Amino acid sequence: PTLEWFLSHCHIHKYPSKSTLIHQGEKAETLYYIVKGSVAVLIKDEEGKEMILSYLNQGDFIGELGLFEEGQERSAWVRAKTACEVAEISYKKFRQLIQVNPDILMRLSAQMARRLQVTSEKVGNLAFLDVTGRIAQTLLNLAKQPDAMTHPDGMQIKITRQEIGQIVGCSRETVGRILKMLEDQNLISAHGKTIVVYGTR
DNA sequence: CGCAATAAATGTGATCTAGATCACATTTTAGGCAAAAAAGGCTTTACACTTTATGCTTCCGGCTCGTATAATCGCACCTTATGTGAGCGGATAACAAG
Numbered sequence A: 001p002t003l004e005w006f007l008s009h010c011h012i013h014k015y016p017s018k019s020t021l022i023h024q025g026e027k028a029e030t031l032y033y034i035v036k037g038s039v040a041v042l043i044k045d046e047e048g049k050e051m052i053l054s055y056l057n058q059g060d061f062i063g064e065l066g067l068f069e070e071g072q073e074r075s076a077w078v079r080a081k082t083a084c085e086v087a088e089i090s091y092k093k094f095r096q097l098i099q100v101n102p103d104i105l106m107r108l109s110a111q112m113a114r115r116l117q118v119t120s121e122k123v124g125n126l127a128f129l130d131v132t133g134r135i136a137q138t139l140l141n142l143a144k145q146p147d148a149m150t151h152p153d154g155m156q157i158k159i160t161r162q163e164i165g166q167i168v169g170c171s172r173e174t175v176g177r178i179l180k181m182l183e184d185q186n187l188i189s190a191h192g193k194t195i196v197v198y199g200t201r
Numbered sequence B: 001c002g003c004a005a006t007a008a009a010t011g012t013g014a015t016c017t018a019g020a021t022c023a024c025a026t027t028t029t030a031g032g033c034a035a036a037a038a039a040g041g042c043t044t045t046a047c048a049c050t051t052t053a054t055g056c057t058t059c060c061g062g063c064t065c066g067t068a069t070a071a072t073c074g075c076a077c078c079t080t081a082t083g084t085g086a087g088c089g090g091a092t093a094a095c096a097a098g
């Protein structure tokens, strides 16, 4: 449909792992779209602690905020998590496609609504719910993600002990303590990054 | 399955604050309602405006009249001296025709 009409003017260019698709400081002159794989977006402070806002899997767009208002810069950093195939379309030639077919814009701004609902309703849980409650909800949220692999016992995901604290809002030390505590009670499992939870499904 | 190497992620655990509890007595808070002090309200009376008829007076202003008067006339002295050519009508001399 409209999606196929979008790939007719794209520029196929594969990006290796640990690459740089979006550099905070450069000029936004290329729209990116995810075909296969996944990518992560995060920011940094003055020390070195990271902070992931939201994850973007396949079928999502990369850097679309610098399209509505011409003359902007890259907000956050976008590092390629895994081998992903991303297209390339200049914003200049994109604006001409909207004036002749606004329907194409109805697709991009359609995914910008869900990314706001999962963030606004998350703040409330990061002010009342304790560590046990915040992490508990996170386990189910990551299980609903398409990048999650089906497990005979439950769900198998791969996330570090830092990214967890960046979602529930806490220190990295606290995460490791509770994580190992649930292991003794036979509730979940962890072997570095891969965390297999139980009770799901 | 092990190997590569730049980035991100890992543990440590004693020290020292950061953030939270509770039930009851003290201290602050909010808008509430008249009173006082102020805004314009919309009265009714105190006075003050230039204006304009007038005519009477003195002072400054603006205009003429007639009168009185001599004249209807006479040297010697001081310092300069426009520029041209072009265009035009008129007066004069030389010429051919009758």
Ligand SMILES: Nc1ncnc2c1ncn2[C@@H]1O[C@@H]2COP(=O)(O)O[C@H]2[C@H]1O
Binding pocket: A022, A028, A041, A053, A054, A055, A056, A061, A062, A063, A064, A065, A066, A073, A074, A075, A076, A077, A078, A115, A119
């Ligand atoms: N919380 C978020 N949810 C979804 N996408 C994001 C989030 N934060 C940053 N991004 C994307 O990261 C991109 C960084 O570059 P852009 O400003 O071009 O566009 C930004 C967004 O598209």
